[PDB]
Design a binder for this molecule. Structure first.
Ligand SMILES: Nc1nc2c(ncn2[C@@H]2O[C@H](COP(=O)(O)OP(=O)(O)O)[C@@H](O)[C@H]2O)c(=O)[nH]1
Ligand SMILES: [Mg+2]
Ligand SMILES: [Mg+2]
Lengths: 171, 65, 234, 70, 19, 158, 299, 72
RNA sequence: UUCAUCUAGACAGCCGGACGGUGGCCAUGGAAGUCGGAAUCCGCUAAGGAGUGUGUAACAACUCACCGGCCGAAUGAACUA
RNA sequence: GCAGUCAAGCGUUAUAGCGACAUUGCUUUUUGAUUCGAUGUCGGCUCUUCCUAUCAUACCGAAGCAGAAUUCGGUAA
C-alpha cells in the first residue's frame, strides 16, 4: 500500500532460495541455501519456533497442500524438494517430517502438490515422478520422455491451488 | 581370436616366467634412465624432455598440495 | 646428487610422535598407582583378535602395550630411577614384545587364566613344525589336501608366480589351474621351519600350532616385591 | 559412454516390448534389403565388379578441367 | 659419554632456539 | 556327522535366493529349491531387507537362520514400507529412530562386540546409523555420540 | 557386408597427434630461412610450412574417418550390436567432431596461405605462420575426448567376432549356467570359458563346423533374465538382438536339475516370454544335464 | 663411427663487436627500466656457530644496559 | 643455509601385527576398502584408511598408510652457490 | 592473438605490483553431412658432392602387437 518495508525475516544463514505464502494466507515458508526451511507468521513478522532441518542440500522448491483437500480445522502440509534428490513432507502443526520420497537419482527441479492427492516431481534425472500421498508416498508413476533435465513443470489447476479459497475480490 | 583373447590367454597360460622380475628391474632402472636422458639428449629432444619434466614436477606438487 | 629418492604415498594415517610415547608413559605411571598387581606378559607374534579377546576377558583390568624401552622407562630402569620400591627387577625382566597387566584380581585367578588360555595359531618361523605337510600330485587346491578336493576350490591362477618364485614350488599353469608334476614335501614333523616354509603353511591356511600368553613375573603394590611365576616358559 | 570407466549399463531408450522390438527389426531388415537391391542394381553392376578383374578407369584428361584454373 | 654429549648439545640448541 | 557353515547376503523374503550358492551347494548335493525355500522361511521378519543368512549343514540337511547385523537392524528399526526392486530404486534411508531402539539394537549386538561398555556398543550402532544416513531422536547420530561423550545421555545398563 | 573392422589405424590422443604432426613439419620441411633472403623466398618458406602442417592434420583425420564403419549403412544386426556396445549417438558425434576439425583445419590453412601472400617482412611472415599453426593446435586440442573414445572403440571393435547374418546359424540361448558354453565347446573349437557361475560369458562367441559339406556357424550368447526390455541391460541386449536379427535355428537350453540357480517354472516362463523373439525361425528346446536328472523321472 | 662436424670456437671479430654493442644496449635498457619501474623494496646468527648462546647473552646485556644508559 | 627425527633407539633392511561394528548406504547379473555416486562414523588400540596399489566374475591372497621386535648412531627434506 | 582465471615463485609488512606451469571465451558446434590483387625473377638439360631434419633397405623399443599387416619412436646417410 505504502511501498515501504514492514518486516524482516532473519533466521537463515545462507541465501533464501525460495519463498511461498500459504494458500490460507497464515504462514510464509522460506527454503534456503543452508539446507533449511523456516516458517514465519507474517502479521507479527516472526519465526514459528525452529527451522525444519533434515535436507542435506539446498531447497529447490516449496509446495503447499491444497485447502480444498485439507479437512476443515487443519493446517495444510508443506512438500519440499531439494538438490539432494528428495521430497520431504512436513506437518507444520506438529513441526515433524512424515514422508521422504527418494526415487530421484539427481537434483529435483520442482515439486507440485496437485488437487487429487498427488505430488509431481521433476528432477535432473530426465524423469517425472508421480507420488500418491494416499498410498504412503509411493511413486505411482515414472514418466520418461525427455532427453535432458526437466527444468520446470506446471499444472492446469496451479492458480486455483495457489489461491485456495480466495478470489480477485479478496473476500 | 575374439573378444578379450589376450586377457583370457593370460588367465589360462600365465605370462613369461621372468615377466615380473624383468618388469621390476626395468622399473628400478628407470631412475638411472631418466638421469641419462636428461644429461644425454641434445637439441629439440632435450628441450622437450626438460619441459615435460618441469610440467610433471609441477603436477606432482599440485597433487601433493 | 646420486641419492635414493623416497617413495611418496598419499594415505590418511600419519606418523605418531613423542606425544604418543609420553601419553603411554603417563598411562603406565597412573595405572601403577591405581592397581595392585602388575604382571609382565610376553605376547610375541600375537594376533589382534586374540589380544582383543584377552582384553575383553579381562574387563576391569588395564592391559598396556607399547615400546619396551618406553615401558621400562615408565617402570624405572635403575634402582635410583624406580617409580616404586623393588620395581627395577620387574622392569629389567621385560623382554621382547612386552605387555603390562595392571589388575586387582587374585594371583590364583591370573595364574589359572594364563595357564588355561590357548588358541590356534600360525606356525611362526624358527619354531617347531606341528605336522608333516605334502601337496598332492595334480591340480593344486586352496587347502592342498587338508580337505577333499571335491569340496575344495582350485587355487587361483594369480598365485602361481608367488608359488613358483617366492615359495620355490615347481608349478605349471594348465587351463588356468595350478599343477605340480610330483607330490611336494613342505615340512617334516619336529623340524625347525624357516620363513619360506612358514609362508607356505600360512598360504595354505594350516594352523596347527598353539598360542599361549607367556607370563614372566608380577609386582605387588603393598608388598613391594617381585615373584617369578614362570608360566608357559618352557 | 564407453571404456574402463563406463557407467552406461542399460540402453537409454529401451523399446516398449519384444513384439515392438521384433517389428522394428523386421522393418529395418526389409529396408536394408530394399536399399541393397537399389544400390546394387547400379554400383555392384558397375564399379565394384571391375575391382575383381583388376581393371581401372582411364585417367581423366586435363582438357575437361579447363575453365577451372586458379 | 659421546651420546650423552650429543644429547646435551641437543638440549642446549633447543633452549637457545626457544629463547 | 559334521556341521558345515555357509554364509550369504540376501534380500529377505524372496524365495530362490540361493542363485549364488550353487558353487557351494554343488559338492554337498543339497537341493537349490529347498535351500531357497528355507532361506525365504527364515527371512520372514525382514521383508525387502538385505540380511545375513547363515546355513548349517549336518548329515544331509540345510537349516537357515539370520545373523543379526548393525545395518540390517537399523534398517528394520527404520520401519520403511516394503518395496520391490522393480518399483523403488535409490532409496534414501532417512527415517527416525529413538534412543531406546538404538539401545535395544546395541543390546542385540553386544554379545559379539569388543566395546567394553553399552555406551561404546551404542556409539558403534550410531556410527552405523550415520553410515545408512538415518536420523536418531531427530538429531544427527554423531550429535548423539557427542552428547554421550559429554554426558547428557545416560546409559541404562551399567 | 564386411563382418570385420580390425584394419583401422591407431588413433593417437590429442597431444600425441599434435606432437606427431608438428614434429613431422619440423623434420620434413627445411628449417633455415634468412632475413637477408628475397621476400618471395621467405613467403614461400612459410607458406610451405603452413600447407604441409595442414596436409598432415587432414591426412590423419581422413585415415580416422575412412577406417571406422558407417553404423547406419552396415547390416542392421551389426548396427544394433555396435549401438549396444558403443552408444551410436556418441560414436557418430565423435566422428562428426573429427570431420568438423578437418574442415576447420583446411580453412585455416587456406586463409593463412592467402594472408602470407602479402607478408612484407620475415617477422610478419613468421608471426602469420605461427598464428596458423597455433590455431590448428587449438582445433586439434579441442578433440581430446573424442580421440580417447575412438581409440578405445577401435581397440574393442577390432576384436569382435565376424558374424555373417546371411549364412547358416545355430543360435544358443537360455538362462545362465545351463550349459550353453559347454555345448559350444562340444560342437566347435571355440575357446569360450565354462565356469559354474552366472555370466561367465559377457559377449557373443562364434564357432564353426561342417555338416553335409556345408559350413555352419554357431553363436553362444550371454544368458537372458526374465525381465522386460525397459530394465534389461546391454549384456542381455546382445543376446536379444542376436535372436531378433539372425535367421537361424534357436536352441533354448533348460537345466531340469536346477543346478543353474533357476527353477523349471522360471525357465518355462522365460521361454514363453522370448517366444515372440523367434518367430519364423527354427526353434528347438534342448534339455541339458541328463546325467543328473531326466525329463521322464520328473514331477 | 661417422664423426660429425664440430662447431668452431675461433672468435669472429664482427660477432665480438656486435656482442659488445648488444651488451651496451642491454645495460642501458636495464638501467632505464630499473629507474622507471615500480616495485616495493639480517640473516642473524648461523645455527652452526658454537658460541650462539654467548653472542645472544652479549646482545641482550647490551640492549638492557643501553635501555637505561640513554634514558638516564 | 634453514627446518625437522634421534639410546623412553635416527635412516635403510628382515620378521610380525595391520583388528571389530562391517560384506557401512545406494547402485549392479556380480561389486565384500580397491568399476562407480554420495557418507566417511564409532569401538579397541602400540597401531591399523569405511582404504595405497596389485589381484578375483565376486570372495581369497599380497601390499602400504600406521605400529611393534631384532639391529645400533647419526639421518631425512627443501633451498643457495 | 586478444581478454580473463589459478598460483610454484619474486616482492613487501603498505593482504600493492611482476609472475612459470595449467586453464576458460572468441575464432568453431554437435549424428562423420556436403579458387578473391604473390608488382619482380623462374623452369629445364648434363654432371659432382655434401647435410640429416630417414621415404626405403639393416638392427632395435612401445602399442589389444594372436597371425598377417600397420602406427609411434631409437641408432643409423
Ligand atoms: N553334470 C553336468 N554338468 C554340466 C553339464 N553341462 C554343463 N555343466 C556344468 O555347468 C557349469 C556351467 O556351464 P556353462 O558352460 O558355463 O553354461 P552357461 O553359463 O549357460 O554358458 C559348468 O561348470 C559345467 O561343469 C552336464 O551336461 N552335466
Ligand atoms: Mg556361457
Ligand atoms: Mg637422427
Amino acid at each position: 500500500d505504502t511501498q515501504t518495508p514492514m518486516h524482516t525475516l532473519k533466521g537463515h544463514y545462507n541465501w533464501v532460495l525460495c519463498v511461498s505464502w500459504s494458500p490460507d494466507g497464515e504462514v510464509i515458508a522460506t527454503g534456503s541455501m543452508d539446507n533449511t526451511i523456516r516458517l514465519w507468521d507474517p502479521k507479527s513478522g516472526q519465526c514459528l519456533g525452529d527451522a525444519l532441518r533434515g535436507h542435506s542440500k539446498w531447497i529447490t522448491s516449496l509446495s503447499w497442500e491444497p485447502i480444498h483437500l485439507v479437512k476443515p480445522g487443519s493446517k495444510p502440509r508443506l512438500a519440499s524438494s531439494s538438490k539432494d534428490g528428495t521430497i520431504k513432507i512436513w506437518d507444520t502443526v506438529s513441526r515433524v517430517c512424515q514422508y521422504t520420497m527418494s526415487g530421484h537419482t539427481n537434483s529435483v527441479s520442482c515439486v507440485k502438490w496437485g488437487g487429487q492427492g498427488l505430488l509431481y516431481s521433476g528432477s535432473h534425472d530426465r524423469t517425472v515422478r508421480v507420488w500418491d500421498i494416499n498410498s504412503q508416498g509411493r511413486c505411482i508413476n515414472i514418466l520418461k520422455s525427455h532427453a535432458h533435465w526437466v527444468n520446470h513443470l506446471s499444472l492446469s489447476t496451479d492458480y486455483a491451488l495457489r489461491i485456495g479459497a480466495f478470489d480477485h475480490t479478496g473476500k | 581370436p575374439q573378444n578379450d583373447y589376450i586377457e583370457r590367454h593370460i588367465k589360462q597360460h600365465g605370462k613369461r616366467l621372468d615377466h615380473e622380475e624383468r618388469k621390476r628391474k626395468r622399473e628400478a632402472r628407470e631412475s638411472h634412465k631418466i638421469s641419462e636422458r636428461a644429461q644425454k639428449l641434445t637439441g629439440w629432444k632435450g628441450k622437450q624432455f626438460a619441459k615435460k619434466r618441469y610440467a610433471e614436477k609441477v603436477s606432482m606438487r599440485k597433487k601433493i598440495k | 646428487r646420486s641419492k635414493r629418492s623416497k617413495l611418496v604415498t598419499l594415505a590418511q594415517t600419519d606418523k605418531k610422535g613423542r606425544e604418543n610415547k609420553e601419553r603411554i608413559f603417563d598411562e603406565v605411571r597412573e595405572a601403577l598407582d591405581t592397581y595392585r598387581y602388575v604382571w609382565v606378559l610376553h605376547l610375541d607374534d600375537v594376533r589382534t583378535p586374540v589380544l582383543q579377546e584377552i582384553r575383553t576377558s579381562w574387563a576391569g583390568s588395564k592391559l598396556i602395550m607399547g615400546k619396551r624401552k618406553v615401558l621400562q622407562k615408565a617402570l624405572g630402569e635403575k634402582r635410583e630411577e624406580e617409580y616404586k620400591e623393588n620395581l627395577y627387577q620387574l622392569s629389567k625382566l621385560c623382554s621382547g614384545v612386552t605387555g603390562l597387566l595392571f589388575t586387582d584380581e587374585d594371583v590364583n585367578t591370573v595364574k589359572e587364566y594364563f595357564k588355561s588360555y590357548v588358541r590356534s595359531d600360525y606356525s611362526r618361523p624358527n619354531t617347531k613344525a606341528p605336522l608333516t605337510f605334502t601337496i598332492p600330485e595334480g591340480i593344486v587346491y586352496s587347502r592342498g589336501g587338508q580337505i577333499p578336493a571335491e569340496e575344495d576350490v582350485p587355487m587361483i591362477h594369480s598365485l602361481e608366480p608367488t608359488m613358483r618364485n617366492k615359495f620355490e614350488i615347481p608349478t605349471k599353469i594348465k587351463a588356468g589351474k595350478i599343477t605340480i608334476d610330483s607330490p611336494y614335501l613342505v615340512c617334516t614333523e619336529g623340524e625347525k621351519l624357516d620363513v619360506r616354509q612358514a609362508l607356505i603353511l600360512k598360504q595354505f591356511g594350516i594352523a596347527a600350532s598353539e598360542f599361549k600368553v607367556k607370563v614372566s613375573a608380577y609386582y605387588d603394590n603393598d608388598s613391594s616385591t617381585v615373584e617369578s611365576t614362570n608360566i608357559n616358559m618352557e | 559412454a564407453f571404456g574402463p570407466k563406463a557407467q552406461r549399463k542399460r540402453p537409454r531408450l529401451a523399446a516398449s516390448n519384444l513384439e515392438d522390438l521384433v517389428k522394428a527389426t523386421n522393418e529395418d531388415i526389409t529396408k536394408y534389403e530394399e536399399k541393397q537391391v537399389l544400390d546394387a542394381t547400379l554400383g555392384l553392376m558397375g564399379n565394384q565388379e571391375d575391382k575383381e578383374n583388376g581393371w581401372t578407369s582411364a585417367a581423366k584428361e586435363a582438357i575437361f578441367s579447363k575453365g577451372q584454373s586458379k | 659419554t659421546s651420546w650423552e654429549l650429543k644429547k646435551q648439545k641437543r638440549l642446549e640448541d633447543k633452549q637457545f632456539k626457544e629463547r | 556327522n559334521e556341521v558345515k557353515y555357509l554364509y550369504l547376503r540376501a534380500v529377505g523374503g524372496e524365495v530362490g535366493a540361493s542363485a549364488a550358492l550353487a558353487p557351494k551347494i554343488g559338492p554337498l548335493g543339497l537341493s537349490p529349491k529347498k535351500v531357497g525355500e528355507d532361506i525365504a522361511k527364515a527371512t520372514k521378519e525382514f521383508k525387502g531387507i538385505k540380511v545375513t543368512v547363515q546355513l548349517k549343514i549336518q548329515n544331509r540337511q540345510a537349516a537357515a537362520s539370520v545373523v543379526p547385523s548393525a545395518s540390517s537392524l537399523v534398517i528394520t528399526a527404520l520401519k520403511e514400507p516394503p518395496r520391490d526392486r522393480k518399483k523403488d530404486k535409490n532409496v534414501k534411508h532417512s527415517g527416525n529412530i529413538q534412543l531406546d531402539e538404538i539401545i535395544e539394537i546395541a543390546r542385540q549386538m553386544r554379545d559379539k562386540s569388543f566395546g567394553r561398555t553399552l555406551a561404546s556398543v551404542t556409539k558403534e550402532i550410531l556410527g552405523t546409523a550415520q553410515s545408512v544416513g538415518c536420523r536418531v531422536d531427530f538429531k544427527n547420530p554423531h550429535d548423539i555420540i557427542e552428547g554421550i561423550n559429554a554426558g547428557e545421555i545416560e546409559i541404562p545398563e551399567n | 557386408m564386411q563382418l570385420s573392422w580390425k584394419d583401422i589405424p591407431t588413433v593417437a590422443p590429442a597431444n600425441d597427434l599434435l606432437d606427431i604432426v608438428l614434429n613431422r613439419t619440423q623434420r620434413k620441411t627445411p628449417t633455415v630461412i634468412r632475413p637477408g633472403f628475397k621476400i618471395t623466398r621467405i613467403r614461400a618458406f612459410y607458406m610451405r610450412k603452413v600447407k604441409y602442417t595442414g596436409e598432415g592434420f587432414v591426412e590423419k583425420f581422413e585415415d580416422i574417418l575412412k577406417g571406422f564403419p558407417n553404423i547406419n549403412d552396415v547390416h542392421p544386426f551389426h548396427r544394433d550390436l555396435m549401438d549396444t556396445l558403443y552408444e551410436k549417438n556418441h560414436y557418430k558425434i565423435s566422428l562428426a567432431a573429427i570431420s568438423r576439425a578437418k574442415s576447420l583445419v583446411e580453412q585455416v590453412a587456406r586463409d593463412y596461405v592467402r594472408l602470407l601472400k602479402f607478408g612484407q617482412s620475415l617477422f610478419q611472415c613468421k608471426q602469420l605462420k605461427r598464428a596458423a599453426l597455433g590455431r590448428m593446435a587449438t582445433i586439434v586440442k579441442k578433440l581430446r575426448d573424442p580421440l580417447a573414445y575412438l581409440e578405445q572403440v577401435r581397440q574393442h571393435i577390432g576384436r569382435l567376432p565376424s558374424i555373417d547374418p546371411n549364412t547358416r546359424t545355430l543360435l544358443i540361448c537360455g538362462y545362465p549356467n545351463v550349459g550353453k558354453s559347454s555345448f559350444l565347446r562340444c560342437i566347435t573349437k571355440s575357446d569360450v570359458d565354462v565356469q559354474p557361475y552366472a555370466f561367465t560369458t559377457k559377449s557373443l562367441y562364434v564357432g564353426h563346423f561342417d555338416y553335409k559339406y556345408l559350413r555352419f556357424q554357431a553363436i553362444d550368447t550371454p544368458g537372458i533374465l526374465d525381465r522386460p526390455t525397459e530394465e534389461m541391460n546391454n549384456i542381455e541386449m546382445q543376446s536379444i538382438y542376436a535372436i531378433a536379427h539372425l535367421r537361424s535355428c534357436v536352441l533354448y537350453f533348460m537345466d531340469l536339475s536346477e543346478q543353474c540357480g533357476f527353477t523349471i517354472e522360471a525357465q518355462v516362463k522365460l521361454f514363453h516370454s522370448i517366444k515372440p523373439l523367434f518367430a519364423n525361425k527354427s526353434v528347438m528346446v534342448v534339455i541339458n544335464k541328463t546325467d543328473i536328472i531326466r525329463p521322464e523321472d520328473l514331477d | 663411427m661417422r664423426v660429425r662436424k664440430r662447431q668452431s670456437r675461433r672468435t669472429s671479430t664482427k660477432l665480438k663487436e656486435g656482442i659488445k654493442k648488444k651488451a651496451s644496449a642491454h645495460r642501458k635498457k636495464e638501467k632505464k627500466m630499473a629507474k622507471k619501474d615500480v616495485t616495493w623494496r639480517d640473516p642473524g646468527i648461523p645455527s652452526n656457530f658454537p658460541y650462539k648462546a654467548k653472542i645472544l647473552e652479549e646482545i641482550e646485556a647490551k640492549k638492557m644496559k643501553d635501555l637505561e644508559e640513554r634514558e638516564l
